[PDB]
Amino acid sequence: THSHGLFKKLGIPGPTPLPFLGNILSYHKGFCMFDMECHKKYGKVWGFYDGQQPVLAITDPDMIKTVLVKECYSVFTNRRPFGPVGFMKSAISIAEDEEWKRLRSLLSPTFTSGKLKEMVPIIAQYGDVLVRNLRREAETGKPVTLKDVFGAYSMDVITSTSFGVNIDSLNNPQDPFVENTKKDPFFLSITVFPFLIPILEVLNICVFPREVTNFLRKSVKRMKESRKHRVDFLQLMIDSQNHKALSDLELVAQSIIFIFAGYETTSSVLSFIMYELATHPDVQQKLQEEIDAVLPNKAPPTYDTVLQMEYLDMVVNETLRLFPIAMRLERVCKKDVEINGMFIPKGVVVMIPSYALHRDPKYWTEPEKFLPERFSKKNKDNIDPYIYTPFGSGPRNCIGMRFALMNMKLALIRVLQNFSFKPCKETQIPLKLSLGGLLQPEKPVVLKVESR
Amino acid sequence: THSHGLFKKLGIPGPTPLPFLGNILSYHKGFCMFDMECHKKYGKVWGFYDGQQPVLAITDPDMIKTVLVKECYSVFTNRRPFGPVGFMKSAISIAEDEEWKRLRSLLSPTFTSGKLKEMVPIIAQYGDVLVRNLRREAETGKPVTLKDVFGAYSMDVITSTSFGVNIDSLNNPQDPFVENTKKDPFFLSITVFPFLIPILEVLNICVFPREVTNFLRKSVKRMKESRKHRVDFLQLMIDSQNHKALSDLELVAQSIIFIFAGYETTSSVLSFIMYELATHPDVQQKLQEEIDAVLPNKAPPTYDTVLQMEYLDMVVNETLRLFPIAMRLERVCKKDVEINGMFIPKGVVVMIPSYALHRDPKYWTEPEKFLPERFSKKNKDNIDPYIYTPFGSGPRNCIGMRFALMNMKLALIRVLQNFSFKPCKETQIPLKLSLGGLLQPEKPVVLKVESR
Ligand code: HEM
Numbered sequence: 010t011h012s013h014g015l016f017k018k019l020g021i022p023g024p025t026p027l028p029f030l031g032n033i034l035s036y037h038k039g040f041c042m043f044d045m046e047c048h049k050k051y052g053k054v055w056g057f058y059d060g061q062q063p064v065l066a067i068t069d070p071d072m073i074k075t076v077l078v079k080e081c082y083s084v085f086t087n088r089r090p091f092g093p094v095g096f097m098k099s100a101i102s103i104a105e106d107e108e109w110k111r112l113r114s115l116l117s118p119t120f121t122s123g124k125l126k127e128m129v130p131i132i133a134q135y136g137d138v139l140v141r142n143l144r145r146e147a148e149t150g151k152p153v154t155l156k157d158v159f160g161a162y163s164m165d166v167i168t169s170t171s172f173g174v175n176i177d178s179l180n181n182p183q184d185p186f187v188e189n190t191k192k193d194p195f196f197l198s199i200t201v202f203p204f205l206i207p208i209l210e211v212l213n214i215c216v217f218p219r220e221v222t223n224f225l226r227k228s229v230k231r232m233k234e235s236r237k238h239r240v241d242f243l244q245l246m247i248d249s250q251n252h253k254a255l256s257d258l259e260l261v262a263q264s265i266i267f268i269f270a271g272y273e274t275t276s277s278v279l280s281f282i283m284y285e286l287a288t289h290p291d292v293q294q295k296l297q298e299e300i301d302a303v304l305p306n307k308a309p310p311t312y313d314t315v316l317q318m319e320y321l322d323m324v325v326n327e328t329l330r331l332f333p334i335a336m337r338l339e340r341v342c343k344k345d346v347e348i349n350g351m352f353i354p355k356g357v358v359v360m361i362p363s364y365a366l367h368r369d370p371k372y373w374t375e376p377e378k379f380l381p382e383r384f385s386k387k388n389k390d391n392i393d394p395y396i397y398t399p400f401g402s403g404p405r406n407c408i409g410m411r412f413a414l415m416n417m418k419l420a421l422i423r424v425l426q427n428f429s430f431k432p433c434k435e436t437q438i439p440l441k442l443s444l445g446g447l448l449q450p451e452k453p454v455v456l457k458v459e460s461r
Numbered sequence: 462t463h464s465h466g467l468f469k470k471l472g473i474p475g476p477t478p479l480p481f482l483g484n485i486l487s488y489h490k491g492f493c494m495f496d497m498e499c500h501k502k503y504g505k506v507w508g509f510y511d512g513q514q515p516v517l518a519i520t521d522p523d524m525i526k527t528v529l530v531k532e533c534y535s536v537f538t539n540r541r542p543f544g545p546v547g548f549m550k551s552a553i554s555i556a557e558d559e560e561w562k563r564l565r566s567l568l569s570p571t572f573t574s575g576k577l578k579e580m581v582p583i584i585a586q587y588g589d590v591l592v593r594n595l596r597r598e599a600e601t602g603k604p605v606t607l608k609d610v611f612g613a614y615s616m617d618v619i620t621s622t623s624f625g626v627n628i629d630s631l632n633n634p635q636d637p638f639v640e641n642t643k644k645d646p647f648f649l650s651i652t653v654f655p656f657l658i659p660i661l662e663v664l665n666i667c668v669f670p671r672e673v674t675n676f677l678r679k680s681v682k683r684m685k686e687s688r689k690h691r692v693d694f695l696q697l698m699i700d701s702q703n704h705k706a707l708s709d710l711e712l713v714a715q716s717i718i719f720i721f722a723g724y725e726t727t728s729s730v731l732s733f734i735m736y737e738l739a740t741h742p743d744v745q746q747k748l749q750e751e752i753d754a755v756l757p758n759k760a761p762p763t764y765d766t767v768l769q770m771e772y773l774d775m776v777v778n779e780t781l782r783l784f785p786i787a788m789r790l791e792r793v794c795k796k797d798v799e800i801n802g803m804f805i806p807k808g809v810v811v812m813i814p815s816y817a818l819h820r821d822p823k824y825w826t827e828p829e830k831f832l833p834e835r836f837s838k839k840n841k842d843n844i845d846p847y848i849y850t851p852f853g854s855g856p857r858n859c860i861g862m863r864f865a866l867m868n869m870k871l872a873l874i875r876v877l878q879n880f881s882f883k884p885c886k887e888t889q890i891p892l893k894l895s896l897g898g899l900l901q902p903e904k905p906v907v908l909k910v911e912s913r
């Protein structure tokens with residue numbers, strides 16, 4: 010109990026921490042359940058301890074605005090340091106202070122709307138590939154695992170948009186990439202034993218499978234040498250090094266982040282969306298009518314076409330409210346500060362419980378209900394942008410927010426143009442969330458697929 | 462050999478490091494001998510590795526000026542982090558960045574000439590006490606250990622000027638203070654195992670004898686409560702908390718630093734000075750003549766009197782050239798920079814080899830000779846202030862430089878007013894330096910003392 014007396018010294022409520030462990034035993038219900046219990050019990054501000062690390066949760070939109078936007082460069086610049094990282098410390102989502110600001114500025118032009126519209130014809134090709142794989146498992150006439158067909162699509166999209174490697178992941182069990190790209194009782198121990206991280210670093214024990222990273226460092230340098238080109242993420246970073254220019258090892262670190270970003274997140278949300286569309290056939294029918302109205306006759310989706318669909322944007326936003334895959338937003342307090350009326354000491358991790366704020370009765374009518382009409386152009390104005398934060402906010406929000414929304418909507422249009430999705434006897438209704446550290450279904454979502 | 466390829470990648474020469482160990486095996490001759498060998502062999506700039514930590518040594522006065530003075534606040538602000546520190550991280554000599562700048566500004570008024578002249582009558586009382594203890598061991602008629610009588614004087618001076626505790630350390634074997642204040646195969650292991658420092662911190666293993674610190678935290682709070690006052694270091698810090706105000710635990714951290722500063726450093730240099738005066742009776746006679754001229758008839762020394770003696774200042778400066786007790790000046794490179802023509806990467810410890818620069822034939826005639834006339838008002842102008850740095854330089858130099866010079870000279874005047882010092886059969890001539898990490902004699906200095 011070295012630092013376990015900080016929150017009661019500041020008059021901040023919270024759960025009573027145990028020695029060494031802190032409040033990590035309260036994670037037996039999960040990250041999200043623990044935050045909703047504390048928010049319902051302690052109010053707008055409370056504190057807890059991840060081992061010996063003090064964490065302060067805030068729910069006031071003005072205070073959230075000050076942390077994420079106002080005092081981002083001055084006070085709340087970085088996220089919590091995590092376990093044996095290794096060379097991936099040069100990744101943008103992990104880098105800190107000026108090292109991050111240099112990487113953020115070197116990668117911001119990559120995600121502009123100009124580069125994004127140039128990627129529409131690429132990620133539309135795999136939308137047709139996704140329809141092909143779905144047409145097979147539909148005539149199979151038995152429940153289909155969504156995270157597999159969506160995971161393949163998300164893997165095909167991210168490898169083509171970042172390396173130009175066009176594969177059929179579901180039908181090619183092992184093109185090298187597919188396998189290497191296809192690749193807790195340890196993070197909990199790291200949280201209770203944070204002093205062991207320097208030991209794992211000097212032992213080169215990288216959490217990343219060290220038996221994979223080298224495969225990309227040579228694959229990238231092969232593509233560097235071998236390079237009618239081109240519109241992939243690698244090229245936009247190759248043309249950038251032509252602040253201070255990037256490094257070749259820094260180049261590989263950002264490539265790995267975009268994959269874990271463009272894979273698990275895209276496929277998970279797409280699975281949550283299709284679960285809600287299957288469990289609400291009225292919403293699925295209305296969405297298919299808007300798709301057929303904007304794209305008559307199964308016309309191919311375009312950049313300007315995707316942005317025109319309002320109900321599609323309403324369906325995506327509502328699923329992200331129920332399932333914000335990040336769960337929490339976190340910032341480290343770099344110095345003794347005093348924001349919006351309260352004093353924040355140095356070293357405290359300021360956390361925004363995004364999952365709990367998205368299901369708070371103070372801001373949402375029937376929080377557990379899936380109601381896309383919350384985000385209609387009539388009701389969207391009564392939604393605080395610092396309560397609904399699926400992509401974060403401020404200078405360090407999701408840099409691939411526009412790419413994620415465009416990639417998911419392009420798949421949703423091509424999928425719903427040809428198929429309807431019904432629950433199966435195997436479908437878990439209602440959907441239970443994973444008890445662990447990730448925001449994923451307890452049971453993988455399986456649904457019945459029928460051709461239109 | 463993780464980072465052992467940095468200096469050859471930058472084209473910087475230096476000794477070839479061994480895996481894990483680096484160049485620490487070359488310390489078998491000592492810090493100072495290793496620096497003089499590298500300076501004679503590699504030139505003005507070289508690099509080595511303390512384990513895995515890269516260290517770059519510089520000898521150019523313009524480059525030294527840029528590190529210590531010009532880019533102090535921007536680039537070179539802190540010193541190397543060292544081993545399990547504990548609560549003493551709040552000490553000024555250990556604090557970093559704004560935490561140090563707040564402590565440096567809160568302790569700068571303590572060492573002004575106004576506070577220093579107010580301490581002359583206090584540390585002159587123990588000058589008479591030092592004459593008394595010397596008069597006994599002189600009539601003993603046998604060699605006298607200088608570091609004991611000087612250590613007692615230095616201990617009596619620092620406890621009275623920082624807590625008002627007036628004791629006779631040599632004749633009181635244990636007033637609590639004396640003992641508690643009287644209080645490597647481990648620093649070497651920490652250098653090779655720097656990842657174990659977080660382990661020693663969570664185990665509360667403080668290198669400082671944890672069985673002593675608590676004695677001061679309650680002694681200070683006793684003096685806080687019990688307090689015709691007063692001119693001690695504690696009061697100047699008590700009146701300061703009446704930036705952001707100091708803390709009571711921060712108060713104890715600075716108190717421990719001033720003791721280790723005002724004890725071992727004052728007594729060691731005083732012993733080096735009396736060794737040179739004994740081995741050079743001509744210098745000792747000329748110094749006694751200047752003392753008797755400025756202070757006729759064994760008159761008591763005053764503040765204005767000490768500053769008038771030029772040859773005394775020449776004797777002190779020349780001994781500090783031969784024996785700069787700090788040995789090295791060190792600064793951590795906070796960011797990628799490019800000083801005076803060369804690029805310095807982030808994380809590199811920039812080191813100024815003070816001992817090697819003080820004995821360099823490029824700037825000193827007969828470097829091994831003790832010649833006080835180097836600092837006469839005629840020859841003092843040809844001495845580069847960034848080659849002769851016994852107290853460092855810049856915004857983070859020795860904050861107690863004026864106190865150290867005044868305290869040592871006050872003892873030298875009262876000692877030389879009554880006694881002359883001759884070598885004994887036990888006196889080590891010439892004096893060998895300690896083979897370890899400290900700058901102290903190999904054998905404790907013993908001399909024959911005779912009353913005038
Ligand atoms: C449904 C999909 C996604 C969601 C909901 C999402 C959400 C988020 C959130 C909440 C953050 C943290 C924001 C903050 O802390 O304020 C974040 C960070 C980030 N995201 Fe995403 N993301 C998604 C997909 C992607 C994709 C596809 C990419 C890249 C291709 C990406 C790249 C990043 C990066 C690089 C960061 C860190 C930015 C930085 O540290 O400067 N994300 N994302």
Ligand code: HEM
Nearest residue numbers: 553554722723726787851852853854857858859860861865
């Ligand atoms: C012969 C006696 C002394 C010598 C030769 C000496 C020398 C030095 C040197 C070389 C430094 C490092 C400067 C740098 O890195 O640029 C230093 C730092 C320091 N010294 Fe001394 N010193 C002596 C006595 C004292 C005394 C008596 C005190 C206090 C009563 C003291 C307090 C300090 C402090 C606090 C620092 C660190 C300053 C900071 O980090 O801001 N020293 N000293």
